[model samples]
Target: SPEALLKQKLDMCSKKGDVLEALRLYDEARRNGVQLSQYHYNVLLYVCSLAEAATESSPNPGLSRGFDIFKQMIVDKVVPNEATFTNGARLAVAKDDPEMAFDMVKQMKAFGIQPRLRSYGPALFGFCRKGDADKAYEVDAHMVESEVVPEEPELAALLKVSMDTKNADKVYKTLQRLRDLVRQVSKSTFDMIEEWFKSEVATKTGVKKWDVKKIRDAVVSGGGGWHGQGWLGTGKWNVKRTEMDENGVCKCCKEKLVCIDINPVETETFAASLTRLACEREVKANFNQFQEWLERHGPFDAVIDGANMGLVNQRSFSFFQLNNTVQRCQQISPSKRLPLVILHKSRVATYPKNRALLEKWKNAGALYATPPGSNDDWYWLYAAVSCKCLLVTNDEMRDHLFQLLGNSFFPRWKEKHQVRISVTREDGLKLNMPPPYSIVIQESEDGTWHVPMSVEDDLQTSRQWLCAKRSK
Candidate 1:
């Protein structure tokens, strides 16, 4: 009966944000031979965290009481869980002790609960509050390295902190990864990033006043902030894996291979491809825009998917061998012309091995680097399909890219446009075109393309594909 009374009193004190009263009740209960449970301490700690309702110009009195309660929990072996660690960590952050908040997260792992992104929020918020970019970057890099797929708000919070510090490289890298994570992130999130840049224009030396277009334009150029971070500085883009072994072996495929994905933005390629058919009567915007590039570099017999070729060559680790790619595309061309090649700017900028090859390819009239604001796959696909030439690479494009192009795409892809290439120990380079005629569509020409409206509802059997198989 006494323990029950203490629990009720503690609950009321916590809900009322009465930290001192909560602690006083606990001391009274213990003095009067009343037993307290973990719930009592958890509630009291929560009350301590809520003490921030007052001004931050001075320390809040509730913080020390909350700290004492948490230490007592550890000393008495009360055994913490998600709630205890989360609450204690928040109180530490409020006290401006991110190290303590981080220690709470570490304790959470020892208690067998993997901390989520929200679990790290207190430390991130604390470092941001201090305007410490280096420390914030350390926290952020750890969050990413923990393999936690951050939600837009989580990443945006870090961006705001990075903005506060005005560390150009950190802000640039965060935005780089954010842009890389397009489908997972929203346009509105990017709008927030643009607003940050626009705000900085007037105050910060980095961005020009009223230059949101300049930011987007720079994104189009090489994928960074208003200023550049060179090629490798742009950083490689990757997505979170669904399952991975402790040693980094993927549980799904059991491959130790990282870089399991191409790019996060590819998630929307299918939808962008689809809008073509429904809006076909509307305008030829993409057509005309691409047509200008084609006409300027006219009379190409094929378009090469440079990254695809490099991925195949390096077995998905690196995108080297532009030399081999150029030579192979030349050999595959029936007209013996150096077919137009589309390469991601990072492929040239990030991969040092490709530097000489890039300059060579550019001089030889065979290279067009996909700009920062551009999607490499989209640029390559649009160029090849519009050139009415063969898309020379081994990319199946069967997933997101496939969805974007729809049914009309793969059919035409199989028809006259696709040339699958392979690496070999014996033949040096083997190029195979899809068989002459598998199926025919009456309404479409040889290279006709459209985003598909529907896919077979059968094959998406598991929960994994279902999440990624968004119709949009």
Candidate 2:
């Protein structure tokens, strides 16, 4: 009965993201005559200090409650070990209470709990976060002196505290030291750091063209204003694992990998540029106007993230419009048909089914209906050639297909390719006709390039005349 009650209490506690309720369940279980073992007690103490709440956020709690709980464990003669102390230390760090964190460290020693690797990181990180770099450094030195080798990822936080203390040299030197200590990190690890911190590396290397320079400046200047360090600059960049199928037999089966990233506007100059462009009226105008604006500026869509991956149909009104382009002509009103496609921008693998689906779609059967990611790549190579489909999305992917139209990897194909790089509230309707397709260079009846089609002979001539009237 007590065991069943304990399980129920754990379940109830687990559902809540709130730390306090977790501790309460830990306590209430005991009150319900459920005795916990040492492991469970460690779980309980960890929950108490592992969670901290300000009176502003958690009205039921303040500092005194956590301190009281810690004391209760000691009074109960539950030997507070390293795990308990470290968990509490992390909690204190989370609460931005270095004093509380430091006290826990001392208590751990007093109780003969040997401090493990990185037991004080949170506290040090907290101190740094609180703008007390000096105290943060003190914690840093103490950890190094303790001779505990922290995990590579955890060391980033420690290096950050050093940076917080305005020690860029120290951060650099410490990274070098980590390299020396490890003697050999995996190539994959370094590659990951290099890609994810592409901007940060640029900053470090003194390249200011894009964002790297700004990130470097933040690291150098201790610009407390920097926000994207943890997600963008840091190594834990939403790296994704994708399926790679080398066998031809499994080609058409589409399976996909997804990579999500936060493009932090790191440097001030870059940030200013983005702000300036974002404010432009032309930049926010219709597709053609926006295209000209893009030549001057660039793509701005998809930066407002945290929504579903959208390719075509960016707006709800345009959703049906974009869908109409991808759908069959019979299904799409003849008046509403346009040439556009929206899909994932990049993927590591190539799926066969997608290619087959693309050929089928273009031939009046497959591309739009092709099951996405039952295959390999985000870019559909086959349909891209046959249908003249132009892909669109907010992917800052290097080596985009359009960029490589004539390259070795992407030999110039029969079809021309151009992406609608931007669209805005002004150009939101995605006017279907685009004044009709102009025969800029006429193809003879045999489909070979011929002399340029006269402006008057083009299909768009009437549409152009209409446009001129509309303009008037």
Candidate 3:
């Protein structure tokens, strides 16, 4: 009954913020051979952690009585519960010593008590804010293994840790899980990640910057996954190059003058397009309705070709398929971008099978339908062209479309802008982005204009010459 009364008085002291009075009563009780409850130790410890222990009473933990109370709790065989350890850990954090906080958890484990998220969190975040994400990661990895659901602030801290360590892969994984759990991540968190994705992932970072897996993860994480629907894959498709240089010879000269024409290097092509897109954003120049729309919602990071995208499954169309189309495109993209999707409106209404799916996409504003009584493909090309965004499609048209685009229109720019996409059963959607074709800005008395030089123009010029057989 005396011990009970002592705990009641200690709690009253704790309520009054009187650490000296609380521990003084503890000392008095101990000297009189009265037993102390776990409540007495826990309450007294919590008070000490609030600040310096009151000096008068018995030098309570508030006045440097923490470890003494702790060891005394252990020496006296007072079982330390989760709260007991958590409060001790909190004390270390309050002192701004993350190492000490971590040590408390390890000590708790040594005492046969499993640490909970609360026990681990203070130390985890303490180390994080202290600029030692390495230790924070240890706690985080443990929490992940233990299936501890992280609060947003904790998750944001881990993201910072990942960023400090320059581990984009970790940043991606952490951010994805964070966005999924939270309905809306804070603006600060979102802005930080967006900046990293642009500065670190997209820009030139020499050798370490080009890891395709990290690149893919960064984009998907930054953009909040796919737009229309979800998609899956190992992200191998990001590095695949569909365009490279092909070597041949002049057909008329017994192949004497070896000709080398660069072909598909899809990643490079996409990179080039990205460069141009960013450059275009800087310069207020040649852009149409699509570009204006792009300027509003964009300066987009990437674009998806709805026509070629939908052709993957080759079904009439469905909300599911349409969703998958855009989703996978986003997933496969190298950077976060507002995908300007252009699709033929016929799929929206003319087809009995496609009408529902078309209507769904229309309602969602997920994809733009080409106007009635017009060539839909032109809009797809024009949108990508005007917006200066990477066009995700399989159409590398050097066909009739090139002729219609006119020689002055820069067919070569199309090659650089066109991000050819192919979907395989094994790898999902693969993007073949060609390298940047040279920007040829020709100026003369005919005025000045910048242009791109595609291999198509080269082929035509080569046709005009021969080493020995030409009659010109």
Candidate 4:
């Protein structure tokens, strides 16, 4: 009952942003020999963090008080959770002791508590603020080892530190990372990159001559997306703030960018990963049988989501619309090959009128009906990945089923393979193919860099880009 009353008062203090009262209450509770739980300690620590952030003067009372509570928490063996460690790290950073902050994160592992991205922030950004690029990089490496993926803010801090140190190579690598992790960088990061390109170091650092044959082979090996063999030319760096044309050609250099795809090896790896995930989540035998069928019937140019295509803008299922989509795909395909259609067995059984149509697809070796009570999403998705072909679906794939595939590579694969559909009473059926160019930051074989700028709800072609190149 006493603990409950104290918790109520503490909650009120937290709501009113009264750190002093909260800390006083904690002191009173401890002096009175009242029992304190992990919750009370965590609340006090959080309030202290807020206090530290609000205070600007030296000799921060919040920093000192928070550590006292944390130390007592350790002594009492109240076992800290994620929030406790995070706030403790924040206080350590505020005290200008990033090594302590980093050690706190390691202690989280000692306590069997997994560190989140926020847990790493205080130390990572603290080192960045000190312009200690090496320490920041070490934090980043630890983060990757812990399976904590860095978001924009973390990557941006790394980029800033690398740029500040005038490490052109590290900056390039960070840019590549930013490209992979956050396709379109935030405005602040965009500005940082623009400033880097215009810097004197950028103009001075590149090599004048490189092995052209070696560079070309590297580009080809990367599926012609980019060549990451380092800067290719040396001269005054030419930087242009520009936009791409409707055709994805940079208005600055008149070079048409190609959509970057995972190379053959990456595709194979992605397919295998998808297979393993599907077998774990779905009925293993059914998926295994589907995989065998796919291998026998073989590779296709595209895989159509039968139910999705059939229900487009219709009150009931429309087999005609589905057939229309298949026909349209066939017409556009270079080989004029029929696309594999994935549908549920129930859908096939219910649609008697489309029996002839289903038979046609079956005779053409293009239909794979999933068993009853199974998700068609896994089947169609796996088929598309395994075949390394376009996937025709209006589904955004943002649901829980898609979330299991992990974030890093699934999105890149989708950008290159997924074909969206639009149907109107006037337009019949329109397939929106994947964009002509990848949206991520790109480094071309000619030592040119194109960085896409982040904008809210803007067309990819209309979005502004920064183009950095070497002058002839």
Candidate 5:
């Protein structure tokens, strides 16, 4: 009963961030011979962690007291948990000894406790603050081995350390990791990149000339997304911060960046996966028959979700609206080709007034009506994938149906191929084409770096890009 009451008091002190009171309670408990539990030790440690380190006028008593409590916990033979290790590491970091903090995290595995991002934060950031890039990288490697992914702050710290040390290879690697983990970097990370480019170290480093053919081959082989074995060119770095034009041309350099897509090999695998999923979920024969039909009339420029397009901005399904969209697609096509339209059999049966339009589509071999008790999503999606063409519709494909086809490359595929549309009485129809350039960090063959900043809005035209290139 007395120990339970002591825990309540300790919890109150922890909640209030009262390190002094909590330490006093611990002392009282020890004197009274009250058996302290793991929870009591953790609460006291947490409260101690809340205490600010020594000020100029007075030494903070909490730091020494926290470590004393921790050592006593070890002597008591009470096993530590995640919070215990994390708080212990925090105290070590506060003592300005990141090595101690780092070692504490390494000890977690011995106790069969998995380290979280927070568990490593104090040490990772401590090394970063100390300007010790090598130790920070070691902490990072340990994090990677622990299967703990770094967020923007952790990656930013690593990026800062790499840039500070002028380790170009680590800088490139951290940039790539940052791009993978974060689609759009925050302003702080953006500023760090800007500083790196402007640094004299960046300008002085890098090779003057490289094997042009080898670099080109590497770029193509890496899904044409990025080519980054090492820094490419040398001399005074030319840095520009500006927005890209609607065509995704860098306003500063006038270079049109390519929209990166899934490689051909991956696309083929994706197509096969979609087929397997469709066959498993739908009537196997129905999808197989469609596949055969696609092979016969195949390889169109685009695939349309007919029902989705028809119902846009209309109370009822309008074949007229759908026809307008089809015409727009055809006009945009270089060869003026008709897009493959996937409509449901029920939609065709219900729309008697649009029979002529349906007949027109069928005659052109532009339409495929899904059979009864079937889903049209699988039909249109599969057609787009197998044909390797543009998919037209505003459906975000975030529903349960699309969830079954979960793949990391799905978003990349959609970005390269999806066509979004909007209709207005005055504007008639407007197609929002996918941006011509990928938003991730791009390292050009010429050794230029283009980093797009993540903004608060979705207007791609207004997005800022950091262009860092070698002087010509």
Candidate 6:
């Protein structure tokens, strides 16, 4: 009802399009002992700014008298929040004033308010209009760091701005930072992705050039018969545990522990925790390593996020950042446009924002087989996400996958696509994670990159990640 009354006033102002009179009415409401919240004042400003009678652009976001409205609100001692600032940012965009839009963002932050992704779209476009897309991206970066929750549009702006300008360095830095932030939020996810990345069998790093099967076999040899390789143990585990009974061929080990130590609560928890921890690490480390590798390897033109980074909960966001990263890499790379590869599974837990991030970043790059489950081929995908594609996954898979590629697919891809698959391994994992998150870049034939394990790599260790990479 109160809002309705305010709306009535707002409607009257709309009919007249009189900023000054509207300000006065708002003042009267205050003088008349109407306890108006700052948000309330911002609402009136927002509504008034939308008047049919347009005013001149404020060299800010979009309003004709946007700054004037803002000043009046300030005079009225009205503070703003997410919605209030977004209204102003949108107006700045409409007026093609990138700086004004950015100012609104800062103003909101001064009030501890964060903007949604859309709020930056207008500002980004404003920057583009003002021939300073870099500033637009800067604003976009600030948005990424905010807590108001990220949306696709902000990412879209980030990708477009970075790629348009060929700032691969900046793109890489942003992605890594994002990965780290996501990790701190949840450790369980990091653990699962981490363990999954380790080579089942030994390759260059280990005794022999082992593949997945070899690694599984080694896990078996190391007293690990079942419950998946990562959690399997030595001869003590081979006899009684259901994990190793499948082959029934543990004849060599005579001294087997007869009674299995089992805890109803702890057993399942341990097993599940093993994978969960791996997952978390995979997601976090993958992104961290990827950024480091990028700086060492790239003078990229257009960098982008493959969105395949193996992060828990922030799948969509990881996805969005991947696409954005890939686009940026392309624009900045001195070499030809590159493809992408990501660490993803069918059932990795992703947050709702991931959906939004996914949609926003899809246009930026392609995604691979990171389905929403725990058992998808994230590790295998990490192992072989095409040649030179930015490979984002758990660190456990990086050298294994890279060695696999350098030994196998790399030459093939170069011969076939006439390009190399440059990979970057990031660090990550949290939320009861196993450890060792990673990320990377994989190039495609047509050159549209894909990222799978964006969340995992950069998020492994944010401070290290930030310092390691060359910033935008």
How do the predictions measure up, each by TM-score? 0.39, 0.33, 0.41, 0.71, 0.64, 0.34
Model 3, which residues run further than 4 Å from truth? 52-63, 71-86, 145-147, 201-472
The global Cα lDDT (0 to 1) of model 1 is 0.56
Q: Write the per-residue lDDT of candidate 5 for residues 197-236, one digit (tens) a residue.
A: 8888888778877899888999988766577668877777
Q: Give the Cα-based TM-score of candidate 3 against the true structure.
A: 0.41
- In the range 1-472, model 3's lDDT, one tens digit per residue, is 8977987887788788886787788789879998777878888778777774343665434636666676677667677777787777666655565666666666655666566767677777778877786788888776776566786678888888778777766765675555345423455665555455444342322222234455456445443222211112221112111112322222333222211122345335543554354434433332244345545554444566676666655765444444565666566557643365677656554466567755654454446765555445555665565566677666556566444443323444564566665557898645666443222211111111111112333322321221211111
Give the candidate number with the greatest lDDT.
Answer: 4
Global Cα lDDT for candidate 3: 0.54
Scored by CA lDDT, what does every candidate get? 0.56, 0.39, 0.54, 0.82, 0.81, 0.40
Error of 2 at 216 (Å): 32
Write the residue-wise lDDT of candidate 6 on 1-472 in tens digits.
6656765776677576655666666667767766666656666656555543335642322244556667566555565566675666545655555676667666656655555656666666677555476687676568658844443334434434554565544443433333322212123222222221222210111111225565546544432212121211111111121111212111232222111122245433433443444456456455334434433443222222233332424534444444444454455446655434333444222567765544443343433334344333333232223122333333333354334332222322222222212233463321111112122221111111112222334334321111010011
239-278 in candidate 1: lDDT tens per residue? Answer: 1223333343334433332112223244245335544642
Model 4: per-residue Cα lDDT over 149-231, one tens digit each: 99899999999999899999998888878877787888899999999988988877888778998988998886665677887
Evaluate model 6: give its TM-score: 0.34
- Which pairs, if any, clash in model 5? none
lDDT of 2 by residue, 1-472 (tens): 7765665555455445445676676667667766654455555445555455665665234244555566555556566566666655545655666766766665655665566654576666667667676776677666676665555544555555555454544554544444323322233433433332233432343111336565556544432212122222222122222212322111222222111111233223333433343334222333233234324521211111111223433553233343333443223334433332323324201456644543543453122221333221222332332233343322332254334332212211211222223335676433222111221211111111111111222222321110000000
Name the regions of candidate 5 deviating beyond 4 angstroms: 1-3, 27-38, 57-59, 67-97, 263-433
Error of 4 at 450 (Å): 2.8
Clashes of each: 8, 19, 16, 0, 0, 165
Which prediction has the highest TM-score against the true structure? 4
lDDT minimum window of 10 residues, candidate 5: 454-463
